[PDB]
Amino acid sequence: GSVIKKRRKRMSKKKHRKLLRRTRVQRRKLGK
Amino acid sequence: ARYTGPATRKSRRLGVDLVGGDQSFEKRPYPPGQHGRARIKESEYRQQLQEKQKARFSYGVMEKQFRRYYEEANRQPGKTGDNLLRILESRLDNVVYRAGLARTRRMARQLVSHGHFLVNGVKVDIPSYRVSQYDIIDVKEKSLNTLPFQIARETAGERPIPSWLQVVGERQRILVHQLPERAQIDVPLTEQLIVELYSK
Amino acid sequence: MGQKINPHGFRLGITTEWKSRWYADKQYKDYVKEDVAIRKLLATGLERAGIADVEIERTRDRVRVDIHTARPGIVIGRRGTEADRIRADLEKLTGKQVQLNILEVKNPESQAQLVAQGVAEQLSNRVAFRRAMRKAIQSAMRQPNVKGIRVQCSGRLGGAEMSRSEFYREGRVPLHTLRADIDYGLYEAKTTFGRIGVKVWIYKGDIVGG
Amino acid sequence: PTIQQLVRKGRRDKIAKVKTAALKGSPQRRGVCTRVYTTTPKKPNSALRKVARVKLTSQVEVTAYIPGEGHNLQEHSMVLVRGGRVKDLPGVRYKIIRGSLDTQGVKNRKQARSRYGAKKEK
Amino acid sequence: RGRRDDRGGRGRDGGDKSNYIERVVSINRVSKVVKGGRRFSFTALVIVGDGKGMVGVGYGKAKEVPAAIAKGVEEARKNFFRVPLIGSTITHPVQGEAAAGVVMLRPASPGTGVIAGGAARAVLECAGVHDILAKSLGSDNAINVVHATVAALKLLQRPEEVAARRGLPIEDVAPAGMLKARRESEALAAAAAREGSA
RNA sequence: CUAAAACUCAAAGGAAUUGACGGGGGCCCGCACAAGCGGCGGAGCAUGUGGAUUAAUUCGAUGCAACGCGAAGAACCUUAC
RNA sequence: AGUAACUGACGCUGAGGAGCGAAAGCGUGGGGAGCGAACAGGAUUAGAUACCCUGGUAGUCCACGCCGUAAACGGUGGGUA
RNA sequence: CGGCCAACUACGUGCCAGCAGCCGCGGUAAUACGUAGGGUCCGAGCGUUGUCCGGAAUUACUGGGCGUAAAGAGCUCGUAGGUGGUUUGUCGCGUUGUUCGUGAAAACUCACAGCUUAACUGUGGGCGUGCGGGCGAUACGGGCAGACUAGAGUACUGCAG
Ligand SMILES: [Mg+2]
Ligand SMILES: [Mg+2]
Ligand SMILES: [Mg+2]
Ligand SMILES: [Mg+2]
Ligand SMILES: [Mg+2]
Ligand SMILES: [Mg+2]
Ligand SMILES: [Mg+2]
Ligand SMILES: [Mg+2]
Ligand SMILES: [Mg+2]
Ligand SMILES: [Mg+2]
Ligand SMILES: [Mg+2]
């Protein structure tokens, strides 16, 4: 089909990965 | 509750004569109200509801009673329309109105509610009394020697007595042989539309 | 609707004639004044009676009117009640006499102005404008020595709000051709909602008329 | 398809989709009223809807709209909240009944006669 | 649709034979985009048929509602359709499948009454059925439902026809009740014919 | 990887049909581009418009397609301020 | 594929499970020509932390192991007449 | 009382006050708001709230699909399961027919009867979709005892990569 849903999923995954990269250090400090 | 408004209004709104003998209907065939010349869109549901409303306003029956009659007709093994027409014509008010002892359906209902008959020698004051086969409808002397009953029995020239009703003489003892049928009733309006409406 | 020029207004000196054919030095003003006054006076009457053209000519201090009525009998009723009445009205409104002389048309369906008047009356009589235009086109094309027709009823059709301009035509109606002898009719109908325009074109034949 | 799969596991309902958190299905409830103010509907309809935060007796806090023209209730009043639906107001799913405990009916009303708590005039 | 029951001063207004039960399903405006502005049109879904059972659907397209209705009527008259019947009901239960319209039709006893959607009830009333059941399962449309009804009616077959196709006489294909109903319908038709001729 | 809940929306999607467009392509025109001529834009005069006053600066046109337009006649009149 | 001999139903799928599994990334010991994440500058842009240019650390390669992710698209499961 | 859905005329409110279940209606000329009438539905009930179902084929066994609407696991091996070629005999677990007892009373319905009709009530049946025992049937699903190659796997001679 079109690429609207694909672009939405890409944006969501990119924001999730950015949040993960930001909170990586905190998650590691909590899981150490 | 019993209807009290004018019957000519409903007759003109529906487009058919409900009382039979009337001149206002034929003089003003258009629906009543400020808007009687407006073109109304043809609708199957509209016509189906108008048929049931005509039947109701002509037979003087409530909506719950009509629904119960339709349910009993559908429950019966026969056909819905004919069964409903039969159970509606078997009423004592319409029976005595068609037998010639009354001029209008309203007058027949009033008389049968005032307790002026004797079903099998027992008093009755319910217009919804459904007669049966070989049933006898008598009249007490107090209501027989009165003015309205005398006029009703002497003016027996409006319509002929059907095959399922008979007058056995001057006593106005209404006798029924069997239940009515489609050909014996000969109702102007049909019943298929009312059946299709109530079967929604 | 469109920028098409009036064929009569364009060929007023080539093919079509003029409704006011006279000349006067410094008195043309009063002449046209009396002309438009007579026109406004006869508007309602001759519109209810059916009018096609009012040709007015000026003579030595008198007038010469020629009105083309379609339905004779409404304006010409009893001799001394309607015709003489309107004549006396015109005379007392103007500063001279009026030797009114009516001329009957040969076919109401062949005149554009009469077709426009009829279709406007039909539309105002609360009827279907489409059917009215169709029947008018049929009447005007039932071999009244014609070859083409084009009727248009613009404005608020059907008492609505949108300015619907139904373009209805039949036959051959060329506007760029000069050798056309096409008759034109412009009418303004008054309804309970506003104004309506009626533009008619009747291409009779390809007569030179030189 | 795959009657074996159907017998193994599958063919279950989707969800109950509770309409409103009626707290055991109470059609009409009461509570305390607070901050009777005005809200703005969406862009297709510009108006001022009179709403108020109602703390019902079921340990819940919602926002109810007062239908009608003139509202008589105010801070610390006894109202009758019922389940409604307002499309123009995003997030409002409750209304108030006028003329139940402390609310007053609308003035100059002889057509509705059922909602807004309109009485019969003599 | 308006100003049709008039009385013109012309010779004839359209009074002729072929008084079939014409019925319109729905009429919706169709728009087309061009270089400046939009052009509107009208599509009419008409169904014309005789009370005997011969039905026919049409699809008129024009720029006016009356013209579209007339085009649909002409298309229906040009493309007819035959339908079998047993007295007043359908022959056997069927399930027609159009592109997306799946219309299931079932018989019924005399006096039940037709029950179907908008377009289905319209086409069935235009046909010679009075007491049957029908249901359109999806596609939420009218043209597709009409086509599905047409396909269902086409999938039907007469009793004598199927008997002659399978190579067997009567009483070996039709049930006893269906045969009795067919005999009653034939008797009623013969009575109507003789009472109309005499 | 297993995987929801609250909240929100009256849609979100799939195919094709007609307009608009591609700094997409192909076939062609307009003193349109190129060469030339005479200019506006540089200064004074004439008005019109924008903007500011005003007892009133009547009213408008808001590009191309309004701005030597309505003024093809403003001391009273025209003029509606 | 051919011979068609051999047992004569031993045929197909498969919940969990097991194996393989594009590129990218990590550990160990090497190597690293070219290309090339990040990084430096040169240039346009009002702003270029990018498209363009110049050098280049990981990566791209080898052996031992790991996560099991792709438009892993024929977006179309395996088997039968 | 705009279309769904049985039913319109005028005054005041003209982004306001409001109406409303979905579409959704008002920015001076609202059949969509209030008010006056007129029409429609019902009638001692009428509209609303909360709940369950039909429509919604909208958990599709009766009743859908998985290329582009939601969807073939990225691909293979395999446990339990599902399932299975032709044919002879045999058991009859499934299936089918019959018969006995139950499936309470009660409930729905067919017929009759009473309370003036009806609601309501009583009587004779169907139903109480099943279950427990006996017998019959063997084509089919199932088990056991046999046979065979069209499926399955192996053998010998060549073949592309
Ligand atoms: Mg300049
Ligand atoms: Mg302007
Ligand atoms: Mg100019
Ligand atoms: Mg002055
Ligand atoms: Mg697995
Ligand atoms: Mg690698
Ligand atoms: Mg490494
Ligand atoms: Mg580089
Ligand atoms: Mg795959
Ligand atoms: Mg087998
Ligand atoms: Mg029992």
Helix (H, G, I), strand (E, B) or coil at A2: coil
Closest Cα in chain C to E65: C130
C-alpha dihedral (E10, E13, E16, E18), degrees to nearest 10: 170
Closest Cα in chain C to E6: C127
- Binning chain C into helix, strand and coil, the percentages to the nearest 5 are 35, 25, 45
Angle (CA) C159-C165-C170 rounded to 5° is: 125
E121 neighbourhood in chain B, CB within 8 Å: 44
Residue-range domain boundaries for chain B: 1-91+186-200, 92-185
Query: Which residues does residue E59 pair with via DSSP β-bridges, in sequence order?
Result: E45
* Token representation of residue C37: 């006054």
To which H or E segment does residue A6 belong? helix A4-31
Among chain E residues 24 through 43, which have CB within 7 angstroms of nucleic chain F?
Answer: 32-36
Q: In this structure, what are the phi and psi dihedrals at residue C153, rounded to the nearest 5 degrees?
A: -120, 95
Closest Cα in chain E to C139: E10
Same-domain check for residues C123 and C189: yes
Same-domain check for residues C62 and C100: yes
Place of tokens 């760029």: C176
Whether residues E113 and B80 touch (CB distance < 8 A) is answered with: yes
B1-91+186-200 with B92-185: one CATH topology? no
- Number of structural domains chain C divides into: 2
Q: In this structure, what are the phi and psi dihedrals at residue A26, rounded to the nearest 5 degrees?
A: -65, -45
To which H or E segment does residue A5 belong? helix A4-31
Cα–chain center distance at B171: 23
SS3 sequence of chain D: CCHHHHHHCCCCCCCCCCCCCCCCCCCEEEEEEEEEEEECCCCCCCCCEEEEEEEECCCEEEEEECCCCCCCCCCCCCEEEEECCCCCCCCCCEEEECCCCCCCCCCCCCCCCCCCCCCCCC
DSSP annotation string for C83-111? HHHHHHHHHHHTTS----EEEE-S-GGG-
Helix/strand number for chain E, H first, E second? 5, 6
Angle (CA) B192-B195-B196 rounded to 5° is: 85
The domain that holds C39 is classified in CATH as 3.30.300.20
CA–CA distance, C118 with C112 (Å, rounded to integer): 10
Rounded to the nearest angstrom, the minimum Cα separation between B98 and chain E is 26
Same-domain check for residues C126 and C205: yes
Q: In this structure, what are the phi and psi dihedrals at residue E95, rounded to the nearest 5 degrees?
A: -145, 95
Distance D25 CA to ligand 1 centre (A): 80
CA–CA distance, B110 with B113 (Å, rounded to integer): 5
Q: Distance of CA C173 to CAs C184, C203, E63, Å?
A: 11, 6, 22
Point out the domain boundary residue: C72, C106, C140.
C106
* Token representation of residue D30: 């009461």
Among chain B residues 97 through 126, which have CB within 7 angstroms of nucleic chain H?
Answer: 119, 122-126
Pairing of strands D94-97, E23-33: unpaired
Residue C33 lies in a domain: yes
- Number of structural domains chain D divides into: 1
Domain that holds residue D84: 1-122
Q: Distance of CA E13 to CAs C14, C127, C145, C156, Å?
A: 43, 17, 25, 29
Same-domain check for residues C145 and C93: no
Whose CA is closest to E189, among E17, E53, E48? E53
Give the single-character DSSP code of C159: G
Residue E93 near residue E105, CB atoms below 8 Å: yes
Helix ranges (H only) for chain C are 7-10, 28-49, 83-93, 112-124, 129-141
The domain that holds D27 is classified in CATH as 2.40.50.140
Interface size, chain B vs chain E, as Cβ–Cβ contacts under 8 Å: 22
DSSP strands (E only) in chain E: 23-33, 38-49, 55-62, 94-97, 102-106, 133-136
A25 CB neighbours strand F below 7 A: no
Please say whether the structural domain B1-91+186-200 has been given the CATH code 1.10.1050.10: yes
Distance C129 CA to ligand 11 centre (A): 74
CA–CA distance, D11 with C101 (Å, rounded to integer): 96
Cα–chain center distance at C21: 18
Residue E146 near residue E57, CB atoms below 8 Å: yes
DSSP annotation string for chain B? ----S-HHHHHHHHTS-SSSS-SHHHH--S-SSS-SSSPPPP-HHHHHHHHHHHHHHHHT--HHHHHHHHHHHHHSSS-HHHHHHHHHHTBHHHHHHHTTS-SSHHHHHHHHHTT-EEETTEEE--TT-B--TT-EEE--HHHHSSHHHHHHHH-TTSS---TTEEE-STT--EEE-S---HHHH--SS-SHHHHHHHT-
CA–CA distance, D3 with B103 (Å, rounded to integer): 70
Whether residues B195 and E113 touch (CB distance < 8 A) is answered with: yes
Residue C11 lies in a domain: no
Pairing of strands D60-65, C195-203: unpaired
* Residues sharing a CB contact under 8 Å with residue C54, sequence separation 6 or more, in sequence order: C19, C38, C39, C42, C46, C65, C66, C67, C68
Residue E137 near residue E104, CB atoms below 8 Å: yes
- Tell whether E106 lies on the interface with B, counting CB pairs under 8 A: no
Same-domain check for residues C82 and C131: no
* Residues sharing a CB contact under 8 Å with residue B174, sequence separation 6 or more, in sequence order: B95, B96, B99, B101, B136, B137, B165, B166, B167
Resolution attained, angstroms:
3.2
Domain that holds residue C203: 107-209
Pick from E2, E109, E114: CB nearest B196: E114
E 94-113: CB under 8 A from C = none
- Tell whether E5 lies on the interface with C, counting CB pairs under 8 A: no
Q: How many Cα atoms sit within 13 Å of E118 on the Cβ side?
A: 12
CA–C1' B161–G69 (A): 93
Rounded to the nearest angstrom, the minimum Cα separation between B159 and chain E is 27
Distance B52 CA to ligand 1 centre (A): 85
CA–C1' E19–G35 (A): 86
CA–CA distance, B117 with B119 (Å, rounded to integer): 6
Whose CA is closest to C185, among C108, C96, C127? C108
Residue type, E67: A
Whether residues B39 and E2 touch (CB distance < 8 A) is answered with: yes
* Token representation of residue B3: 């209807």
Q: In the structure, do chain D and chain A come into contact, i.e. share 3 or more CB pairs under 8 Å?
A: no
Q: What is the CATH number of domain B92-185?
A: 3.10.290.10
- Tell whether B195 lies on the interface with E, counting CB pairs under 8 A: yes
Closest Cα in chain B to E132: B196
Whose CA is closest to C151, among C164, C134, C163? C134
Whether residues E111 and B79 touch (CB distance < 8 A) is answered with: yes
The domain that holds C168 is classified in CATH as 3.30.1140.32
- Tell whether E138 lies on the interface with B, counting CB pairs under 8 A: no
Whose CA is closest to E83, among E69, E96, E68? E96
Same-domain check for residues C117 and C194: yes
* Token representation of residue B145: 């020697």
Give the single-character DSSP code of E55: E
Give the single-character DSSP code of E42: E
CA–C1' C57–H58 (A): 84
* Residues sharing a CB contact under 8 Å with residue B166, sequence separation 6 or more, in sequence order: B174, B175, B176, B177
Name the experimental technique: cryo-EM
Burial of E76 (0-12, 13-18, 19+ CB in 10 A): buried
Q: Distance of CA B196 to CAs A14, B45, B74, E112, Å?
A: 60, 10, 11, 8
Residue E153 near residue E168, CB atoms below 8 Å: no
Question: How far is the first Cα of chain C from the last one, in angstroms, to the nearest whole number?
Answer: 32
Whether residues E64 and C127 touch (CB distance < 8 A) is answered with: no
- What C185-193 contacts at long range (C-beta under 8 Å, 24+ apart), as own/partner pairs, is C185/C111, C185/C112, C185/C113, C185/C114, C185/C115, C185/C116, C186/C6, C186/C116, C187/C113, C187/C116, C187/C117, C187/C120, C189/C120, C189/C123, C189/C124, C189/C155, C190/C124, C191/C123, C191/C124, C191/C156, C191/C159, C192/C159, C193/C156, C193/C159
Which residue places its CA closest to the C1' of nucleotide H56?
E138
Q: In this structure, what are the phi and psi dihedrals at residue C24, rounded to the nearest 5 degrees?
A: -160, 140
Helix (H, G, I), strand (E, B) or coil at C196: strand
Residue C8 lies in a domain: no
Residue E91 near residue E159, CB atoms below 8 Å: yes
